[PDB]
Amino acid sequence: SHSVKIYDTCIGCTQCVRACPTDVLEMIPWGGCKAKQIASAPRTEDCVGCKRCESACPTDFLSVRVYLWHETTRSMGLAY
Template sequence: MSYRHTIYTDRCKGCGLCVAVCPKQVLEIATELNAKGYFPAYQARPEDCIFCSTCCIMCPDVAISIVELAEATA
């Protein structure tokens, strides 16, 4: 199974809760502002993500999602 991790940067206010709880230290706070004037979180090391969803649970703004991708059938 494969998964997709998405951070909706326009929803993120850069509180850093997701960064603090990530067990693999995948997330960091960006140095560029989003449309609302916040520094959003981003995946600095996406290859290290284990898709545990801890970041999704902690995000007070529901700005992070992890979804299972449908497998291609031949």
């Protein structure tokens, strides 16, 4: 299972959650930004590691990060 971490520079634009192809991410309420929103990653046992979320984040530097880690059946994307 890969690791996905959210950092407090997040502006809560939700662009990363819209992009995930396996539904790893989620929005949760917060108080540190104008959107009162922050991303979370509750379901990292399904993450294929495509970094489609990182291409979508606009902050500099990134607010979502994907660290590739130990591989499994779901992580490798095997249908057999």
